[PDB]
Write a protein that binds this DNA or RNA. Structure first.
Lengths: 459, 87, 93, 105, 97, 97, 78, 95, 103
DNA sequence: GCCTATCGATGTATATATCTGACACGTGCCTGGAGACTAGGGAGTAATCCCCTTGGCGGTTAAAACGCGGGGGACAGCGCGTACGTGCGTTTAAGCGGTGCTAGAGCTGTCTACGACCAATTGAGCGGCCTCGGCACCGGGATTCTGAT
DNA sequence: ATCAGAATCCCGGTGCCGAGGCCGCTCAATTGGTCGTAGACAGCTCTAGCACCGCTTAAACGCACGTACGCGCTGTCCCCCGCGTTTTAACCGCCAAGGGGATTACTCCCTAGTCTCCAGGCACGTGTCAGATATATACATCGATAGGC
């Protein structure tokens, strides 16, 4: 057997074991990480070692977590032969001959791009189950990921999340239907939009909708599990733009001058003004050549965004208060600007980015942990998932997101499997800018969702 | 360092081997490298003429997208005909 | 929305020369554009002929000679015979 | 039969051709013979073309005609090649050709 | 070790590229170049996707034709290597100015 | 004495480039035209003007192709035109069958 | 009677065509090329003549033929 | 009996505009008359084709202007264009 | 006249009439013939300049086909416009390639 | 110095395998086609006028033809060493799967500014006959040459 | 080398007449008012196009090497040019038929446009299997070595 750690584990396992004893797939929507893996692996050894169902398991999880996923397996379940399919095409080819032709595993560990390319094995070789978490691609019924996976050969499968429904009900019935479409296909064919009239039955029978779901989905809240109950406080920094980017802001709204041709904000493309306005408020030197001299490093960088004018002092102040931080950016070039600021300060940082390999990411975890590195520089999409980044006392969203579910996912890198400090969360806003507008529209998506969607064990 | 990146002009993005690959389809056995830049120039003149007329069709239609028929009419008005993109 | 095409006619004609065969949408698309082109070429010449010969009215005689003014001889001769046969039996109806 | 094409024994749509000619402005008037004659010509041409393409397709073991087969036929018939000399076929390619000088010996 | 004689593989390439018919320039570069030239005529203008493919068909086709003329020009000079002046002569004798 | 080879050829060129007059004997050309045309149809009559128009167009048509052949020979680093040059040029025009 | 196109006539034309020297094989080839060119022109002009029910060719048939054959000559006709 | 129109007097007067001292030949006038027709022929074909491609019953100044910019290279086009708009301006300002 | 109303020497009414007969469209707006006439008059004049100059260079006042051809072959856009076009008795540009010339 | 092998190198052809998205196909739906109908003048017929091309005549000259020397270019072959075809390892960014946004293509309905239309009106520009001097084209010059020393 | 002389311009003279003008007139362009339509305007819809990320890798790039090709060089020779020669018929001005074109008056058939009726053609959804693709052969032809002989 594995380990006993947390009170909600066995109840969840018994629920899951019951669900699969009901001979269906199901959904577990509890908060982020929480060792849902652990409870899932407990379910596996419940199969392998109480049911004695040693039918080979398969798992898909993101590239950022695979090594930590192995670590979670290695911590408590080396009693399962868990093998990972990874690496160069040659490596992938060898592992076919070495293992797929050989069945010498309890668990197959895989990630999405590889399993899509090598789907033939996943069609052809029967698994006991697939499991997927962070599965939010399955929000989209156009995703080839879902279309292929729904074709793969399994007895049943388990769907996991701690961030359900990023935008809209179609995501729900997609997620819902793709687990048991043999019943629910009519739902994604759109009959459910009728059955619950596009959610417009709303608060007047949200219990009815969730009564459709509570027989099939469990979700348990972190605040309900309470436990460590750390602080998470969000704050928002409405601050103005600097005069240079203000002029660029006018120009992006109106016209670029030939000064902005020598700096070459004209002779460049314009067919997403929002993206350009965002860059403008975010930092004008995100535009190539808008840095007035490429050889320099200096206060012009720090001033050319009103954000950096504050964030320099804020970072220095926070670091001086011993508060270490995670910085999440919408765009890598702003992380570069932030890293240029780090380099300009000589402040010491870690970074993870889509180009960074998972092993390099893993060590970057051990490098931002374990030592007083000022900041972890994180791509929101790649970096938001899974990790136990407790080493930061703080998080700042340098640039605003379009789905608060991303902010939740990113913030929930704290507290997952415990956190033991006060954590402060900070949102930067261009005061009197589009950033306010994006914020308001994002908040609207939040207000559209939880007020009904919160049902679950909540109900 | 990272503060900026410099990128080659897309004219040179017509790669040397791509030209060879096309030239081989034209039956070209053996090539002196000056061919490559010369071809780019030739193509640029060729593209420029077609594009100008195409955009001219687009503007007379007051469209904001270039329409594929604008290219067809441009090609055909410039005396070259290409089926399989409407007609 | 709706648009015409020749496709059904081309399809049936295909089943004449090669029954038990099919056609890619690409090819059918190509065929349509081709038929469009041929139509344009003849009709413009028929216009000029009628204009030169002062006729307000395009007539079959314009069609015959326009095709002669476009096709290599044997194709023209075949085409002329076919148009003749079709027109004569039509008007005989 | 009501269908004028059927009275013409054609496949091609006499009625549509007649309408097109009426709308084609090619002259102020159109005589009733002109549409019929053109329709037959077009039908003949299409068949003569498609037959060679169909052969090329069959020779390539394929029951469905694809642009390559058209291009081959159009370029194998030099009269089509001349008739379509100022014309290009997407993904048609070209006929095989090596000038003998290039062959090794 | 081993090596093929000069041109031997190119002959296989030539045969392969005479049988195959796919486009040969990388689409993404080709799109970028077009959109640049478009901006050079018109500061802002969008594109239908298919229009780009239509352009690339015409472009590569036009080029391939010009290659053959240059090939024959070099052959007429009893040269196997092609050189730019053969292209210029070809364009000149094509009456393309 | 004799004028040296190819010397007065240039004065001839200068003359015939500077002058602009017709180069062909009408009656032979007319006879050729007529006894060709008879194979298209019997007893074809002609506008007198038509013969001259045809001759002009014919002379012009040859003149350009001749100059194209000249360049072809020149590119071959030769000064004497040879039949291969015409056949290449006509085909590079695309106007040869 | 194709030899009615005299050798020195061809040479005169080639001189306007800037040719310095001519191998005699050119002359028969020239007559060949010209004959094919003329015939294609004659063809269409006669066709316009026939279509006009005429017995008499006009330069209009010529210029129309030229216009169809990718040429035009200002000065005749109109 | 027979009668036929020309462009000739207009060309002749235009000649007298550019070079009042200067004369011409009937041959040249014939060439000019043919040339004038061929340009008109070219423009009208485009103008028709444009209207058809734009589902338009009516040709107007736009078709001519754009056809000219299609048919003419260089500032020659834009001179002609500006003269056209100018002449249309005079016409439209005239009564 | 409409011609005078436009301030043009070219015959706007005749142009309009020709458009009527030419069937180029079902309908024509009044500006079209006006604009087109201006184009033709302009291009006519522009040619006549070089023709007169060539005549002056030839010490002639009666403009003649030689002058017209030479003019067209010395204005590239016009030579391009008339590239498919030939002029009776016009001849060619006097020029010879250096390869041919004496040392 | 072959010319025939030899292995065998690395190739593409041709093998049979399972697999899917594009395609033959059936549907309801409907507008453009077909079945009527009339209106009138476009196209046709026979008509005459006369011009034009036709065939023909003559004499004079230029153009074509032919004989020739040769030197000059076309041509073949040779040595030189460049630069380019090849196979290598390394890097880039092409390609792809997304993610999310909305600008504008496409449709809708409304109308009324514009042009087609018909009547009469006038001189624009056309044709016919007219006179002239810018044009050819002439003879005989001077110039400005090649090309032999 | 320089001067020879051949054949190229430049010039005044002769003279011809196509070009340039004027007149008679007619018909089409101008002026003018009416009908009714297009298509310009405004509005609403939602597509497909634009943008950055995450990730795989086939691809491009760059490297080093040797090949043969391009190239300048050579000599050989012969077919071209330039030329005087004789021969030819194109040329041109001349004549004169009469075929064919261009001409008009009277004419019916033919098509434009009429409305009625309605299914051939289409947009759409369908099932399914042809080409897709796996990877395996086969045995190619391409090779080198370098056989022997």
């Amino acid at each position: 057997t594995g380990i006993h750690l947390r009170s909600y584990q066995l109840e969840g396992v018994n629920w899951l074991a019951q669900r699969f004893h009901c001979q269906n797939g199901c959904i577990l929507g509890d908060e982020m990480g929480l060792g849902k893996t652990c409870q899932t692996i407990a379910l596996f050894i419940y199969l392998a070692g109480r049911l004695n169902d040693e039918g080979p398991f398969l798992i898909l999880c993101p590239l950022s977590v695979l090594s930590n996923w192995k670590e979670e397996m290695q911590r408590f379940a080396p009693g399962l032969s868990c093998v990972t399919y990874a690496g160069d095409k040659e490596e992938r080819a060898c592992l076919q001959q070495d293992l797929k032709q050989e069945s010498r595993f309890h668990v197959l560990l895989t990630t999405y791009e590889i399993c899509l390319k090598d789907a033939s094995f996943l069609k052809s070789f029967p698994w006991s189950v697939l499991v997927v978490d962070e599965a939010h691609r399955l929000k989209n019924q156009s995703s080839l990921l879902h279309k292929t996976l729904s074709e793969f050969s399994v007895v049943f499968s388990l769907l996991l999340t701690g961030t359900p429904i990023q935008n809209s009900l179609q995501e729900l019935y997609s997620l819902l239907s793709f687990v048991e479409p043999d019943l629910f296909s009519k739902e994604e064919v759109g009959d459910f939009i009728q059955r619950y009239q596009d959610i417009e039955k709303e608060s007047e029978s949200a219990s009815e909708l969730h009564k459709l779901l509570q027989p099939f989905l469990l979700r348990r809240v972190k605040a309900e599990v309470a436990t460590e109950l750390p602080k998470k406080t969000e704050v928002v920094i409405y601050h103005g733009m600097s005069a240079l980017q203000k002029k660029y802001y006018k120009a992006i709204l109106m016209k670029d001058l030939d000064a902005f041709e020598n700096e070459t904000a004209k002779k460049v493309k314009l067919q997403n003004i929002l993206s350009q306005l965002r860059k403008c408020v975010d930092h004008p030197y995100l535009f190539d050549g808008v840095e007035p001299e490429p050889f320099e490093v200096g206060d012009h960088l720090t001033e050319a965004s009103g954000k950096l004018h504050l964030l320099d002092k804020l970072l220095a102040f926070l670091y001086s208060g011993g508060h270490r931080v995670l910085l999440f950016s919408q765009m890598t070039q702003m992380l570069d600007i932030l890293q240029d600021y780090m380099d300009y300060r000589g402040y010491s940082y870690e970074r993870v980015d889509g180009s960074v390999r998972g092993e390099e990411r893993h060590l970057a975890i051990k490098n931002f942990g374990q030592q007083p590195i000022f900041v972890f520089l994180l791509s929101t999409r790649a970096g938001g998932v899974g990790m136990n980044l407790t080493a930061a006392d703080t998080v700042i969203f340098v640039d605003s997101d379009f789905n608060p579910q991303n902010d939740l996912q990113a913030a929930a890198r704290a507290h997952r499997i415990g956190q033991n400090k006060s954590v402060k969360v900070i949102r930067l806003i261009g005061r009197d800018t589009v950033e306010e507008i994006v914020y308001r529209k994002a908040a609207s998506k939040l207000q559209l969702t939880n007020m009904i969607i919160e049902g679950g064990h909540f109900t | 360092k990272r503060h900026r990146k410099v990128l080659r002009d897309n004219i040179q993005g017509i790669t040397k081997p791509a030209i060879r690959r096309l030239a081989r389809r034209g039956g070209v056995k053996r090539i002196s490298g000056l061919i490559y830049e010369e071809t780019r120039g030739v193509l640029k003149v060729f593209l420029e003429n077609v594009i100008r007329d195409a955009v001219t069709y687009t503007e007379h239609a007051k469209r904001k997208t270039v329409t594929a028929m604008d290219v067809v009419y441009a090609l055909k008005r410039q005396g070259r005909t290409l089926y399989g993109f409407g007609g | 929305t709706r648009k015409e095409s020749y496709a059904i006619y081309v399809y049936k004609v295909l089943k004449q020369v090669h029954p038990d065969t099919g056609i890619s949408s690409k090819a059918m698309s190509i065929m349509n554009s081709f038929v469009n082109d041929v139509f344009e070429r003849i009709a413009g010449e028929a216009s000029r002929l009628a204009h030169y010969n002062k006729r307000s009215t395009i007539t079959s005689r314009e069609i015959q000679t326009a095709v002669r003014l476009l096709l290599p001889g044997e194709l023209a001769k075949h085409a002329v015979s076919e148009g003749t046969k079709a027109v004569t039996k039509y008007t005989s109806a | 039969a009501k269908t004028r094409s059927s009275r013409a024994g054609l496949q091609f749509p006499v009625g549509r051709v007649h309408r097109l000619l009426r709308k084609g402005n090619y002259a102020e008037r159109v005589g009733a013979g002109a549409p019929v004659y053109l329709a037959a010509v077009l039908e003949y041409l299409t068949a003569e073309i498609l037959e060679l393409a169909g052969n090329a397709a069959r020779d390539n073991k394929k029951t469905r005609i694809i642009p390559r087969h058209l291009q081959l036929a159009v370029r194998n018939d030099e009269e089509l090649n001349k008739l379509l000399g100022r014309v290009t076929i997407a993904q048609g390619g070209v006929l095989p050709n090596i000038q003998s000088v290039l062959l090794p010996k | 070790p081993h090596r093929y004689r000069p041109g031997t593989v190119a002959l296989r390439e030539i045969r392969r590229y005479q049988k195959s018919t796919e486009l040969l320039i990388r689409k993404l570069p080709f799109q970028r170049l077009v959109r640049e030239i478009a901006q050079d005529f018109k500061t802002d203008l969008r594109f239908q996707s298919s229009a780009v493919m239509a352009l690339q068909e015409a472009s590569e086709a036009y080029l391939v034709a010009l290659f053959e003329d240059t090939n024959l020009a070099a052959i007429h000079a009893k040269r196997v290597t092609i050189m730019p002046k053969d292209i210029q002569l070809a364009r000149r004798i094509r009456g393309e100015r």
